[PDB]
């Protein structure tokens, strides 16, 4: 384990001030330019656009173009230009730091796994929500595919077990994972029709590919709104906040390019331009940066540290999503 933040200190402690409860939704394949708030032609986030206090960041660039590359970089201390995906698993990451300082760390995953991020922490702090053994919401669609909203169920059980402590909950979304976008949402989010239902994205009509993708976004809009709503049921006892950032974008046929995973050296902009949302309760006194701040995945680690009143020398001058 190569550390980077053993100097990290928490200015105030939850026994001397209000405990802090953050959900960080780790998004999947969402494109910034298909977000209504960024100028997209379709209302893809109707539920999010109804909650006061949400900041939308119009200029966010992912560290890479793949789950395996981007997710470890999102929690890393090295920044995108020094980040080594092949060595990230044995570096201290920001969750390692917050757990060491006493923040309770929970990672629920409806995507795949934490891509090595959670490996140094006890395995019980990680839960697979792709399976009905944990996820109570799988029988709502013809595929019995378990749904992101199921990761909210039972979070009150977790809060009760951690009563009074600071908490950070990562919800790793299935989100817009392809190529089967049509499987990613229940029928209530099938607003754009017809939809593409094949694994060979090229054979599909372009409009039908886009409709499947946008429908999948409607389900993600619902999930994030339900996540904020769950947080508001604890705003009395906790300073609650919600960070969402997508791991990367997606190509939808631009220049005949589909899916993602292309190397940064020639990857198109659609694969790196990602949505980010921040919400906080007004009582917390957290102030977002300007909506048009130039931002990258490098902003995540300083954000999470600021949210828990932690300082560390390695990211002390890095720009965050919050002041
Ligand atoms: Au991904």
From Swiss-Prot:
Belongs to which family?
Answer: Belongs to the phosphoethanolamine transferase family.
Paired cysteines (S-S): 63-73, 138-146, 196-204
Keywords attached to this Swiss-Prot or TrEMBL record, sorted alphabetically, are: Antibiotic resistance, Cell inner membrane, Cell membrane, Disulfide bond, Membrane, Metal-binding, Phosphoprotein, Plasmid, Transferase, Transmembrane, Transmembrane helix, Zinc
Q: How is its activity regulated?
A: EDTA may inhibit activity. May be inhibited by ethanolamine.
- Protein topology in the membrane: Multi-pass membrane protein
Protein EC? 2.7.8.43
Q: What is the effect of changing residue 248 to A?
A: Abolishes transfer of phosphoethanolamine (PEA) to a lipid A analog in vitro. Almost abolishes resistance of E.coli strain Rosetta to colistin and polymyxin B, by comparison with the same strain expressing wild-type mcr-1
Entry binding sites for Zn(2+): 28, 67, 247-248
Outcome of substituting residue 67 to A: Abolishes transfer of phosphoethanolamine (PEA) to a lipid A analog in vitro
The reaction(s) this protein catalyses: lipid A (E. coli) + a 1,2-diacyl-sn-glycero-3-phosphoethanolamine + H(+) = lipid A 4'-(2-aminoethyl diphosphate) (E. coli) + a 1,2-diacyl-sn-glycerol
Q: What's the protein name? A: Phosphatidylethanolamine transferase Mcr-1
Effect of altering residue 250 to A? Answer: Reduces resistance of E.coli strain TOP10 to colistin, by comparison with the same strain expressing wild-type mcr-1
Q: Complete protein: which residues are present?
A: 219 to 541 of 541
**Its quaternary structure?**
Monomer.
Which regions face the Periplasmic side of the membrane?
1-323
Q: Where is the signal peptide?
A: none
Query: According to its UniProt record, how is this protein modified after translation?
Result: Phosphorylated at Thr-67; may represent an intermediate in the catalytic mechanism.
Q: Name one GO cellular component term.
A: plasma membrane
**What's in the misc comment field?**
This is the first (November 2015) reported plasmid-mediated resistance to polymyxin antibiotics; although it does not confer a high MIC it protects against colistin treatment in a mouse infection model. Colistin is one of the last-resort antibiotics available for multidrug-resistant Gram-negative bacteria such as K.pneumoniae, P.aeruginosa and Acinetobacter. First identified from a pig farm in Shanghai, China in July 2013, retrospective screening detects the gene in (slowly) increasing proportions between 2011 and 2015 from pigs and chickens, and also in hospitalized patients in China.
